[PDB]
Design a protein around this ligand. Structure first.
Ligand SMILES: [Mn+2]
Length: 864
C-alpha cells in the first residue's frame, strides 16, 4: 500500500497484455518461423501481394489484380488500411519483399490482438464501470475461437482490425456522448470537447477503410438514436448532444473515407465504392435530422399540435419510414444494396459448401447444439449470455441509455452470429464484455472486493466463505477458456512444405520467369469492366487448380491462377462456364481441353486433397446441386464379424456387427474424371498432359516407409488397410495418403475393366504439377488388319517414384494416330526412363521423341 493502487487496475492490464503475447506470439512461433516465414491461411497471403506491390509504388496502391482470376482479373476489396500499414511497417523495417517482408507482416495481427485490450476496456468503462472494464480487458486477451485464430502470429488478415476499430468506434462514440452529456452549447464542442466526436469519426472511417461492409456500423449507431427517441418517455438521454456527436462523427468519417471512395465502377457493399460514402454522409444528415426534431420537442411542438406523450416517437417513425423509404426512388442500386445486407438471401445454394455460411448453433445437418459456442468462446459465451440477461434488467430498472445501446450492438452481432459461422469474431468482444459485467456482480455481491479493499488494507464486514466461491466461479470462467485458447494458438496454418516447395519450384522453373516478377509489381489501372479477358503486355499463360490455392500460387509461385479464394473462376458444367470445377470434374479429355483452351491454361496443379476429400466439393460446384453430385460416389467398405475385405453396393447388404470405414468409396464416373486421371493415374491415359514435378510423399507415409517398401503392393496394402480400420474403430476417417491407396485398391478390384487404363497400388506425391502440351502426333499405317495400338512407357518422378504411362487408340482406315505428351530430353525432373514401346498386333517398335516435336506438335510417321 498504496501500491498496488492505483496500479492494481493497471497491472492486470499489463498482465493481460503479457498473456496475449504468450498466446499470439510465443505459442505459434515455431510454426510460423519455420523453413520460411509461414503466413497462415489463404487471405493473409494476398496482402503479402498487395503490400509488396504498394511498397514498390508508394504511396499508390492497386485496385484491380489481373494477376489472379486468369485471364480476367478480379477487383481488390481488401482495404487500404492494412495495405498501407503493412507497407509502412515494411519500408521502416527496411524489408520490401520475400521472407524479409513476411517476417514483419506476421507481427501485425498479433499486435492488433494485444492492442485490442484497450478499446474493450474503454467501451466497457463507458457503459459500466472501471472494475468491470478491467475484467473485460483481461478476458479479451484469452478468448479463443476465430478471434484468436485470426489474431495469431502470421495470420495477417483484415479480420482482427474489424473488431478492433468497431469496438473502438462504439467506445469512442459513447465516450463522446458521455463527455458532452449535460454540457450545453456553447461549452461543447470548443476544441477540447471536439476531440471526442472527431476521434469517434476517425475510428468509424478507419473501420470502413479496412472493411467494405464496415458501413454497417452507421445504421447501428442510427439504431441507437432511433430507440433513444421513440422511447423518450421510457429512457432518459441528452438527444441534443446525442444527435450533435452523431452528425460530427459520421461527417468526419465520411470526410476520411472520401479519398478512397472511388475505386470501384458502380455501387457495392464489399468494394470501395461511393456507396459507403453515401451511407456515412446520409446518416450524418439523418443524425442532423434527429437534432431539429428534438429541438422542436423542447418548445413543445408535439404538445401544441396535440400529439401528447407519443408525439416525438410517432414523429421519428414516419421520419424514418420516410428518408430511408424514399431511398428506393433514386438511385437503387443504393436501396437494393442496403437491403442486400438485411434480406439474407439464403438458403445456400449451392454449390455451398462453402464452409462458413453454415449457421452457428446448428451442427451441419441439422440439429441444435452449443458446441460451436464452446469451441469458439470457451466459458465466456455462457457467462456472456447470462451477463446480457442481467443487463437486460438493469435497463428495465434503471433505464440507462448507453446500456441500451450496448444491448442493441449485442443483439445485432448475435443475429449475424446466428446466421453464419463466418462471423464468430464479432461476438468475442460481446462475450468478453458481458461476462465481465456478469463476474463484476458476482465479485461485488460475493464480497471479494472485500477483501481486496480491506485486504490491503482496511477492515470490512465480509464472509471468507463467499470470497472462496467468487474465486471458484472466476475459475470456471477463466480455465476452460484459456485451456481452449492455449491449444488453439499452439498451431499455425498456412501451406504445408509440400505446397511451398512445389510452388517455389514453379516460380523458378517456368517460362517468362522474369516477366511475371516485373508484372507482379506494376501499378495496374482500373478497368470499367472485367468480363472481357485482360490485354496482357506479354504472352501470359494460366495456371489452373482448385480455388483454395489461388493466393498461394500467386504469392509464392508468382504465376497466374485461373481461380482464386475469392470464389472466382470456379466455373461449372450445368452451364459450361470454363473454370476449375468444370475442368477437374470433366468427364472426357476433350471437355477438359475445351475449358483449358478457353482460359489459355498451360500448367495444372493438383494435390491429394483435390483427389479425395475436396473432390466432392468440386463436383457440387460443377453439377450445381448436391443430389446431382451423388452420382460421383457409390458404396462403402466394410469388415464383417469374421474380419473380411468387404464392399456392399447397397447400404442394406452390410453384415450385422460389421465394422465399416467412414469413407465413401467413389463411383465409376469418378475414375472417369480429370482429377483422378491426373492424380490417381499420375497423368496416364492422357494426350496433352505430362507430369513435371512431385512433392514428397504425404506426411505420414514418408514416416511409414521408414520400415516399408513402397513398390511391394502386398506390403503397402497391409498397413493401408491396417490403418484404415484401427482408425475406423473410432469415428475417424483414415489419413488422406491412405485414402488414395484404397481409391486405387477399389478401382482395381471393381471398376477397372479387363484392362481399362490400369494403375499401380502405391502412395504418390502430396502435390503434382502437369504441363499442358500439344503432344507429338504419331500416325502411320498399321499391319492390316489390327484393332488397337497400345503405347506404354515407364516414367520416373523427382521422388525416385516410377509408374507407367499408357494410351490406346481406335484404329480406323488402317492408320492409327496417337498424341504423346511426355518427352525425353526435357529439363523437367520428371522424365520417362524408357522409350514408347508401341504395339499393333504381334509387331512392335520403339520410338524416342524430343520436345521440339512434342511441344510444337510435329507429326511423326510410323508404319508396320
Ligand atoms: Mn479473411
Amino acid at each position: 500500500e498504496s501500491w498496488f493502487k492505483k496500479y492494481w487496475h493497471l497491472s492486470v492490464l499489463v498482465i493481460a497484455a503479457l498473456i496475449s503475447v504468450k498466446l499470439r506470439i510465443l505459442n505459434p512461433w515455431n510454426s510460423v518461423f519455420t523453413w520460411t516465414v509461414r503466413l497462415g491461411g489463404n487471405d493473409p497471403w494476398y496482402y503479402y501481394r498487395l503490400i509488396e506491390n504498394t511498397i514498390h509504388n508508394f504511396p499508390h496502391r492497386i485496385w484491380f489484380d489481373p494477376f489472379t482470376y486468369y485471364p480476367y482479373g478480379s477487383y481488390t476489396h481488401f482495404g487500404p488500411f492494412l495495405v498501407y500499414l503493412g507497407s509502412i511497417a515494411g519500408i521502416i523495417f527496411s524489408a520490401t519483399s520475400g521472407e524479409s517482408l513476411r517476417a514483419v507482416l506476421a507481427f501485425i495481427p498479433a499486435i492488433g490482438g494485444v492492442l485490442a485490450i484497450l478499446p474493450v476496456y474503454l467501451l466497457t468503462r463507458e457503459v459500466f464501470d472501471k472494475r468491470a472494464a478491467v475484467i473485460a480487458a483481461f478476458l479479451i486477451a484469452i478468448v479463443p475461437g476465430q478471434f484468436l485464430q485470426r489474431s495469431i502470429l502470421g495470420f495477417n488478415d483484415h479480420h482482427i482490425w474489424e473488431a478492433f476499430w468497431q469496438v473502438s468506434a462504439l467506445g469512442t462514440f459513447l465516450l463522446a456522448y458521455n463527455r458532452w452529456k449535460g454540457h450545453d452549447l456553447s461549452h461543447n464542442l470548443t476544441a477540447r470537447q471536439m476531440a471526442y466526436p472527431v476521434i469517434a469519426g476517425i475510428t468509424i472511417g478507419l473501420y470502413v477503410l479496412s472493411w467494405g461492409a464496415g458501413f454497417i456500423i452507421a445504421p447501428i449507431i442510427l439504431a441507437f438514436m432511433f430507440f433513444a427517441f421513440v422511447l423518450a418517455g421510457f429512457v432518459n438521454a441528452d438527444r441534443k448532444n446525442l444527435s450533435l456527436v452523431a452528425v460530427v462523427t459520421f461527417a468526419v468519417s465520411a470526410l476520411i473515407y472520401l479519398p478512397f471512395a472511388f475505386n470501384y465502377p458502380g455501387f457495392s457493399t464489399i468494394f470501395y465504392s461511393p456507396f459507403q460514402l453515401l451511407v456515412l454522409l446520409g446518416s450524418a444528415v439523418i443524425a442532423a435530422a434527429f437534432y431539429q426534431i428534438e429541438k422542436w420537442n423542447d418548445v413543445g411542438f408535439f404538445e401544441r399540435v396535440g400529439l401528447g406523450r407519443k408525439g416525438m416517437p410517432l414523429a421519428v417513425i414516419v421520419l424514418t419510414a420516410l428518408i430511408m423509404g424514399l431511398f428506393f426512388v433514386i438511385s437503387p442500386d443504393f436501396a437494393r444494396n442496403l437491403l442486400s445486407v438485411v434480406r439474407v438471401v439464403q438458403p445456400k445454394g449451392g454449390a455451398l459448401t462453402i464452409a462458413e455460411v453454415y449457421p452457428f448453433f446448428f451442427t451441419h445437418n441439422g440439429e441444435f447444439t452449443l458446441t460451436n459456442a464452446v469451441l469458439h468462446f470457451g466459458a465466456l459465451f455462457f457467462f456472456g449470455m447470462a451477463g446480457i440477461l442481467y443487463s437486460a434488467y438493469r435497463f428495465l430498472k434503471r433505464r440507462s441509455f448507453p446500456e441500451m445501446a450496448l444491448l442493441i450492438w449485442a443483439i445485432a452481432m448475435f443475429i449475424a452470429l446466428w446466421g453464419q459461422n463466418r462471423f464468430a469474431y464479432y461476438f468475442a468482444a460481446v462475450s468478453a464484455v458481458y461476462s465481465a459485467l456478469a463476474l463484476s456482480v458476482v465479485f461485488d455481491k460475493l464480497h471479494l472486493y472485500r477483501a481486496l479493499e480491506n485486504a490491503i488494507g482496511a477492515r470490512n464486514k465480509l464472509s471468507y466463505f463467499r470470497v472462496a466461491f467468487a474465486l471458484l466461479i472466476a475459475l470456471a470462467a477463466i480455465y476452460p477458456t484459456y485451456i481452449l485458447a492455449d491449444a488453439q494458438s499452439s498451431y499455425a496454418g498456412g501451406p504445408n512444405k509440400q505446397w511451398y516447395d512445389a510452388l517455389t519450384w514453379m516460380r523458378e522453373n517456368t517460362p517468362d520467369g522474369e516477366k511475371y516478377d516485373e508484372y507482379y509489381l506494376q501499378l495496374y489501372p482500373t478497368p470499367q469492366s472485367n468480363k472481357e479477358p485482360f490485354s496482357y503486355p506479354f504472352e501470359t499463360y494460366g495456371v489452373i487448380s482448385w480455388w483454395d490455392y489461388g493466393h498461394w500460387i500467386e504469392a509464392v509461385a508468382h504465376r497466374m491462377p485461373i481461380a482464386n479464394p475469392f470464389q472466382a473462376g470456379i466455373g461449372n458444367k450445368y452451364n459450361n462456364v470454363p473454370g476449375a470445377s468444370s475442368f477437374f470434374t470433366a468427364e472426357n479429355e476433350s471437355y477438359a481441353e475445351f475449358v483449358a483452351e478457353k482460359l489459355n491454361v498451360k500448367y495444372v496443379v493438383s494435390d491429394i486433397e483435390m483427389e479425395t476429400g475436396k473432390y466432392y466439393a468440386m463436383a457440387v460446384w460443377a453439377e450445381g446441386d448436391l443430389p446431382l453430385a451423388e452420382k460421383y460416389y457409390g458404396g462403402y467398405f466394410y469388415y464383417s464379424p469374421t474380419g473380411t475385405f468387404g464392399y456392399a453396393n447397397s447400404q442394406w447388404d452390410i453384415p450385422l456387427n460389421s465394422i465399416i470405414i467412414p469413407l465413401r468409396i467413389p463411383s465409376e464416373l469418378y475414375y472417369s474424371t480429370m482429377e483422378a486421371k491426373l492424380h490417381l493415374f499420375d497423368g496416364s491415359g492422357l494426350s496433352h498432359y505430362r507430369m513435371i514435378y512431385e512433392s514428397d510423399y504425404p506426411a505420414e507415409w514418408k514416416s511409414y516407409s521408414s520400415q516399408v517398401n513402397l513398390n511391394n503392393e502386398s506390403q503397402v496394402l497391409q498397413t493401408a488397410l491396417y490403418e484404415a480400420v484401427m482408425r475406423a474403430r473410432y469415428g475417424v476417417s483414415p489419413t488422406m495418403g491412405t485414402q488414395e491407396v484404397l481409391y486405387k485398391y477399389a478401382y482395381t478390384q471393381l471398376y477397372e475393366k479387363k484392362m481399362g487404363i490400369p494403375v499401380k497400388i502405391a502412395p504418390s506425391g502430396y502435390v503434382k504439377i502437369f504441363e499442358r502440351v500439344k503432344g507429338a502426333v504419331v500416325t502411320g499405317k498399321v499391319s492390316a488388319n489390327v484393332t488397337e495400338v497400345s503405347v506404354n512407357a515407364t516414367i520416373k518422378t523427382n521422388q525416385n517414384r516410377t509408374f507407367e504411362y499408357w494410351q490406346t487408340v481406335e484404329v480406323k482406315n488402317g492408320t492409327y494416330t496417337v498424341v504423346l505428351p511426355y518427352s525425353h530430353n526435357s529439363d523437367y525432373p520428371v522424365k520417362p526412363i524408357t522409350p514408347y514401346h508401341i504395339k499393333a498386333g504381334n509387331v512392335v517398335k520403339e520410338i524416342t521423341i524430343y520436345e521440339s516435336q512434342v511441344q510444337n506438335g510435329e507429326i511423326i510417321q510410323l508404319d508396320l
